[PDB]
């Protein structure tokens, strides 16, 4: 088994600047014919993988100028000279010297940009849902940067834990920001017990944490 | 342009069988070795199997995790390659891609879900509203995926549709939210179009203030 290692799970780049993505193999990929049996792929979000580089350093047909590949026998580098917005996605190396062919875990490219505070909204559970037996309270964090965001749920001023889940969009192709949804799920019985529902948000772009609240009684 | 197209994926019981197909267009299949590659969040990209040409006696190679259970085959006259998957395990869940010899050409992939859980359709609740935020909660469905659009595709400017989260109950849930001017509320109608194919569920919901 040749193990392919990509140390960086993710790499941040300012658009128009260069980036390098590393990969290493537990064994030399140098074939006896002098070629190094290593592929590089890009997988853009929601898309199939696409070949960038073959035999370590050769640009596949139709792949842009700015991509290059280099390396020794066990250490490999993919480089992009000036990162376009079409370059974001996950980069994978792969060896085909021996069976089984093996992939690296991938390195996600993400764009850097100015800090942006989240626009925060809160949504009460719908009456249609309450009839069923459960309540879902949703908090939205729209178009912010960087990714790191702290969401604290409050029910009658009491902090909550274990009863909420988050989900984050990919970097928006337009403004390179993120968005996050945080859903609080309570049973109908406990939801109708308390009145105050608050979503507290801590983010780098906020000089002080913001709180979007509502009282259950309309 | 070369096109590879996979089919045959879906929801299947553990220990059960499922045969995948890959048909090639504008591609002289008989000349090229073919591969199956799969993808999951837990394991990433995994090479599954390969089959060579009639002249190297249709030689096959398999991933260890798959040896004895999967069989790759080809029919040059039908311009197709196949993957017969027997005694399926939960680990086998993922997107299955067909690729040509040098991994330039990949299909769009077919989703294979191995679980004992039955199909269930989702419920759609509204997230009612400077700028106002409007949304739809698509809760409790199995398996993936669900499709959400707005006003039959006319509203796409400020839409954020979130990745499905797996709930404790074993069901998936996701929200789809959009931002529009607060002045539009009351006259501009906002509709979320929801589809869950595995359960044949099609839902349209009005999103208006409460």
């Amino acid at each position: 088994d040749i193990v392919m290692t990509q140390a960086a799970p993710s790499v941040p780049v300012t658009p128009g600047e260069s980036v390098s993505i590393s990969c290493r193999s537990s064994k030399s990929l140098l074939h006896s014919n002098g070629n190094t049996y290593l592929y590089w792929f890009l997988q853009r979000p929601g898309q199939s993988p696409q070949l960038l580089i073959y035999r370590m350093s050769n640009l596949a047909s139709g792949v842009p100028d700015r991509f290059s590949g280099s390396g020794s026998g066990t250490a490999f580098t993919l480089r992009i000279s000036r990162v376009e917005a079409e370059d974001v996605g996950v980069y994978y190396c792969m060896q085909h010297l021996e069976y089984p062919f093996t992939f690296g875990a991938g390195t996600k490219l993400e764009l850097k940009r100015t800090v942006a505070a989240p626009s925060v909204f809160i949504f009460p559970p719908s009456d249609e849902q309450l009839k069923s037996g459960t309540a879902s309270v949703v908090c939205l964090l729209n178009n912010f940067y960087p990714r790191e965001a702290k969401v604290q749920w409050k029910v009658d001023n009491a902090l909550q834990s274990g009863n909420s889940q988050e989900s984050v969009t990919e970097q928006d192709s337009k403004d390179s920001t993120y968005s996050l949804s945080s859903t609080l799920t309570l049973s109908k019985a406990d939801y109708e017990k308390h009145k105050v529902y608050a979503c507290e948000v801590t983010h780098q772009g906020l000089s002080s944490p913001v709180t979007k609240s509502f009282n259950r009684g309309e | 342009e070369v096109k590879l197209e996979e089919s045959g994926g879906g929801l299947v019981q553990p220990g059960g069988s499922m045969k995948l197909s890959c048909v090639a267009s504008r591609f002289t299949l008989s000349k090229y070795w073919m591969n199956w590659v799969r993808q999951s969040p837990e394991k990433g990209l995994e090479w599954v199997a390969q089959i060579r040409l009639k002249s190297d006696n249709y030689a096959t190679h398999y991933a260890e995790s798959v040896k004895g259970r999967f069989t790759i085959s080809r029919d040059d006259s039908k311009s197709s390659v196949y993957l017969q998957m027997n005694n399926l395990r939960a680990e086998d869940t993922g997107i299955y891609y067909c690729t040509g010899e040098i991994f330039v050409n990949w299909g769009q992939g077919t989703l294979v879900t191995v679980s004992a859980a039955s199909t269930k359709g989702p419920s759609v609740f509204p997230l009612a509203p400077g700028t106002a935020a409007l949304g739809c909660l698509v809760k409790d469905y199995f398996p993936e995926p669900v499709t959400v659009s707005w006003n039959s595709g006319a509203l796409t400017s400020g839409v954020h549709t979130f990745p499905a989260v797996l709930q404790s109950s074993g069901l998936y849930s996701l929200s789809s939210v959009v931002t529009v001017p607060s002045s539009s509320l009351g006259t501009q109608t906002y509709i979320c179009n929801v589809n869950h194919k595995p359960s044949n569920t099609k839902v349209d919901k009005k999103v208006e203030p409460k």
Binding site: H31 | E1, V2, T28, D56, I102
Partner: peptide, 19 residues
């Protein structure tokens, strides 16, 4: 149904069975 021979040429140049 190969539309031209560029892909074939590349594949043949890259192919190796003999270690």
């Amino acid at each position: 149904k190969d539309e031209d021979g560029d892909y074939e040429e590349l594949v043949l140049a890259l192919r190796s069975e003999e270690d």
